[PDB]
Structures are given as C-alpha cells and as structure tokens.
C-alpha cells in the first residue's frame, strides 16, 4: 500500500511537470514560427519596393539613351 501511495504522488508530480513542459515548448514553437512568418512578410515587402527602385533606375537610364539620339 505504501508503494502505491508513493506512485500516486509521483504520478501527480510527473503530470504537472509534463503539463508545464508541454506548455513551455508550444509557446516557444509559436513565438518562433510567428517571428519567422512576420519577418518573411516584411522582407517580401521590402524586396518588392527595391524592385520598384531598380525599375526607376532602368527608366532614367532609358531616357538618357534616347536623349543621345539626338
């Protein structure tokens, strides 16, 4: 009976610790996944804007070649 009493309380400790652990790991995965997602969103936004800039240069370079003909 004493052995069973010891197993019950150890089982209770083990489940509380497993609950805490499970919660800790899931939060960490969510915050990590979220950070990566958000940064990728911003990165694609900037990469579109830097294309607009590349096309603007391309346009002024284009005017400079047709003002030479002339």
């Amino acid at each position: 009976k004493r052995e069973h009493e010891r197993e019950v309380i150890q089982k209770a400790i083990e489940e509380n610790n497993n609950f805490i652990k499970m919660a800790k790991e899931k939060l960490a995965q969510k915050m990590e996944s979220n950070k990566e997602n958000r940064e990728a969103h911003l990165a694609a936004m900037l990469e579109r804007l830097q294309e607009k800039d590349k096309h603007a240069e391309e346009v002024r370079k284009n005017k400079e070649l047709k003002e030479e003909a002339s």
């Binding site: 609950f19 919660a23 915050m31």
Partner: protein, 440 residues
Amino acid sequence: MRECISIHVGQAGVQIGNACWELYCLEHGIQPDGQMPSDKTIGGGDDSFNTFFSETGAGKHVPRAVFVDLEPTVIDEVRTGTYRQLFHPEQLITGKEDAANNYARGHYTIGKEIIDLVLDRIRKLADQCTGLQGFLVFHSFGGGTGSGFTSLLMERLSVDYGKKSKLEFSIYPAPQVSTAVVEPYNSILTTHTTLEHSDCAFMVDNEAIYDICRRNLDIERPTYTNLNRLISQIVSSITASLRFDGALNVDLTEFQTNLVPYPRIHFPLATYAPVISAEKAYHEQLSVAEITNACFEPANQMVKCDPRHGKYMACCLLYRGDVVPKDVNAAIATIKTKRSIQFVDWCPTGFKVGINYQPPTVVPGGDLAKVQRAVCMLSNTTAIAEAWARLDHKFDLMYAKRAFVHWYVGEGMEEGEFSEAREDMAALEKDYEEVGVDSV
C-alpha cells in the same frame, strides 16, 4: 488565509478593475489613500480582507493587483485619479502602442515586448504571499490586448505557477458597444488558446448587461460606467466568500468543485438580483423569496441564453446580507415546485447555498438602490453553449471569405491557427451537447 492576485488586462479589464476595487474599498472601510481605520493590526495580518489586500507598515492597504494595457491612456486615468494613492506605481503597467483590435498584435508583435515585465511584476506580488491560492484575470474577448495578450499571459502563468488556479472574468462582445468588426476572430482565438490554462471562467455578455441597465435601471443609453458598476456587484458577490468570514459562508472553491464536472466544461452562468433603482426600491423591501425567484428569470442573467432549453449540471446560490437558511429553504422549495429546472441524469439535483452576512454596498452616484440582501446564482447549464454558437457563426461568415484575415497573417499568424481554433470551438459545442444526453 490564501491570497488571490487580480490581473486586469486591456481597457475593459482595467476599467472593470477600477469599478471592482472602488467597490471593495467601500465594502471594507478602506479610504482612497489606503487607510483602513477599523483594522487594528498594522503592517500586516491574516484577516479575510487580506486575501485581496496587502498592508504596509504605514497602514496602507494595497490591492493584490496588477493593471496591464499596451497603450497608456486608460491606466493613466488610474494613475491620476481618485484611487491613485491606492496602488504602487509599479502595479500599473503600460506600453506605448495598443494591439489595434488584433489578437496577433496582443499575443505576439506588441505583447512579446512587455510580457517579461508583467510576469516580473506579478512575481513581486506572489513573493508577498504566504499561501497564494490563485489568479483572477479580467479581460475582454474582443480587444486585441484583452484577447491576445491575455492568452500569452495565461500560457506564461501556467509555466511559471504550474496548476495554481486561474479564474477569468471575460467580457463577451455585443454590437451595442463593440469597437471592432473582427471581435469574433479575437474571441475564438483567445478562447481556444486559453481553454487549457483556465480553471473557471465567468463570461459577461455586454448585451445582457446592457439590456439589464436599460430595462431594470431605466438607463436610456448605458455607458461603460453603468455596465461596470453592475459588473462589479456581480464580481463582488462571487469573491465575497474569499474577502469576508462567517458561519454560513462557503468558499468559492467549494462551489467550484460542483461547478466543473470536466476540465473543459468550466463556464458558469451567473444571474444576479436584485437590480433595481433607488426610486423603485424605496418602500419596497425585496424578500429572500423575491430575489431567489429573480435568479430563474433569464432576463437577469449575465449571458444571454435559455436555461429552460438546456440541462443543469449544478446550481449554486451565493446570498449576501440579511438572509437566514430557513427563508432560503422555503424559497427554494417554492422554485422547485414551479420552475423548469431539469438536471442531467448523472448529477444530484440539490442547490448548494452560501450566505455572507455583510450586506451589499453601492458606489456614491451610482444607479443601483442600496438593498439589504442580494443573491448571485452560479449555474452550470448546457444553455451557455448558445453563446459559443452565436460567436462561432459570426466567425464562420467572415472566415469563409477570409475577410480581415490578412491583418493577422501580416503579424505572423497562419490560417492554420484559425481553423485549429475554430475546430476546438466546434468540439466544445459538441462537448456541451454530449454532457446533456441521458446515460445509457
């Protein structure tokens, strides 16, 4: 004497906190500067009111509370208001930018920047407790902070305090006073993520409170202040057994044993009476039987739903003021012979009763008559699942077109979390269905 720490999150949470703490100060004889003349033990003690208030050697009684919001203007009014001396400045915590009605900003983008400071501040409160019982967490479903930051906080509290009890007071949205089209999204997301981290949650349907103020107090167009004063009476009824002692007093945790048959089925329906104006209360003494009867009138519930069309799994009556068991028992026998109170078949049908002898108090310049006796009924009924049904339906309408979803995806969330949250709600609605089916 087991301490309880209250945490008030976002505008609704903070403003309800203002109303609750003012009311507790009045009930306990505590002045706006924290001084309590009737308290003869200076600098500490183990009186019932100490579960909610600590004490300094200067005789100040300090709420065991933290107020948190991601923008500063609501808490700033506490900082500069009537009860500003009540709180240590470090108990009032603000960021610079709110969650813009977006769960994702509350839980991740903005919330992550302040979460560590909040836990640090809660920790300081817990360190002053000799036998912390648990937390009471006040917040809206619909706001970005109320929803997203509260979820993040509940997850972190489970990690840091284990299975230490966490109870919520949750403001369920109504269109009469809502401020965001996306409140159904935030409600479902927070309910999903918080479900496993909460022991007991008391939902307060702003529409139920709005309609009680209009109908019972004759307020043409209720403001938050009208709603919040009513809400604080209800919150006070619920916490009174922790704050006052007495022979017939029964502890909230004892009601909780009866209220929660399975971990997920933990949303009691509160009903409160009497709600009546001074003008109608005058020369009209409301007996134990009248207020008890009012508890079974759905118009007096804090959530709109119909218990007559569901089954009870528990019924608790928390009386306060001038009330003796004889009159309670007579009143209950009457209700039993005349009302549609049907229990599930696996639960006993007895009403659990507690009586706190300290009569209710009202805030000066409020709407409620001062009465000699009041009652809050807490029931566990399958009917509360209607509240989830209504919210889940609004979620489905918008989600089928992914309306507004880009605001969440842009803050780093995935569609996966929406469907996961929605499915957990579907399973919850189903759980409430199953507990009402007769045993085989």
